[PDB]
Design a protein around this ligand. Structure first.
Ligand code: ZN
Length: 265
DNA sequence: CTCTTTGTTTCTCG
DNA sequence: GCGAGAAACAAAGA
């Protein structure tokens, strides 16, 4: 989710910025949605200038004019390896540098790469309808409140859409709703102003805490946020606030962990 | 064997 | 448009 992608972004920023790409190889070229041979031709010999993030998307800034947009989906994992590192089964792509290589692996093959130009990045995210970053500066509670008032959607699935605010997935949506004492099936037009305020702040605070702790490990695999989870994967354990048993249900196809006392239906 | 579960996004169907 | 269900894929457990 956003905190894990941010953790990877920071680690990569530290290590590969300034590196010339010597070569690029694929064993699974079909995950390059803009075309693998095209990407190899355009990026070979270019230097990595920066790594940015928007929501759950990583953005490699490569030369002045290219942006490689990468989504890790369910299982994508990057690692920095020596040039002689052996192949592992689900490795799909590598960018080779002079002194090491960046390898992308993805057991389920869901993750994507798209090569687009610098001036097309903002239109790309507008087209995806990605909502604001989860910061006090960008995530305006007033617009959030108005969108929730207008909808009969259930809060968990509406938060997962990425349109009200970017970066929540199954772990942090469950954690946030427990923190804000809101049931995941609550229709959003039933939420009162004070609950919306607590939700807004809890989204920002949980994701910032998860970033600080290097994400949850259930690059970026040394996180400590998993030790702070209150409900996700905690079925049958007791709520830290009230002592009721955490329950698990299915909401719009997703596993959903909540306290039935603290999160009233 | 069959079913279910899983850090996601985006489709069809009615 | 909406919600339900499932595709894309792989692995593991009941
Ligand atoms: Zn509780």
């Amino acid at each position: 989710e956003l905190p894990e992608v941010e953790t990877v972004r920071r680690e990569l920023e530290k290590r590969i910025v300034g590196q010339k790409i010597i070569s690029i190889e694929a064993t699974y070229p079909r995950m390059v949605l803009t075309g693998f041979e095209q990407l190899k031709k355009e990026l070979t010999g270019k230097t990595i200038q920066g790594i940015s993030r928007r929501g759950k998307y990583l953005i490699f800034e490569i030369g002045d004019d290219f942006r490689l947009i990468s989504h890790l989906r369910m299982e994508g994992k990057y690692r920095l390896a020596t040039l002689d590192a052996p192949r592992e089964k689900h490795d799909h792509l590598t960018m080779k540098f002079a002194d090491g290589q960046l390898i992308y692996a993805d057991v389920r093959k869901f993750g994507t790469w798209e090569l687009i130009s610098t001036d097309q990045v903002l239109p790309y995210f507008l087209k995806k309808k990605i909502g604001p970053e989860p910061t006090y500066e960008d995530f305006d509670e007033k617009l959030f409140r108005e969108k929730l008032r207008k909808s009969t959607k259930k809060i968990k699935p509406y938060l997962l859409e990425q349109t009200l605010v970017a970066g929540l997935g199954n772990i942090y949506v469950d954690e946030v709703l427990w923190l804000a004492k809101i049931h995941p099936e609550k229709e959003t037009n039933q939420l009162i102003e004070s609950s919306i305020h607590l939700l807004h702040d809890s989204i920002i605070e949980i994701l910032q805490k998860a970033i600080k702790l290097g994400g949850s490990s259930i690059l970026g695999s040394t996180g400590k946020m998993q030790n702070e989870l209150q409900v996700y994967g905690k079925t049958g354990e007791k709520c830290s606030r009230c002592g009721a048993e955490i329950q698990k249900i299915k909401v719009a196809g997703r596993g959903t962990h909540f306290c039935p006392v603290c999160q009233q239906k």
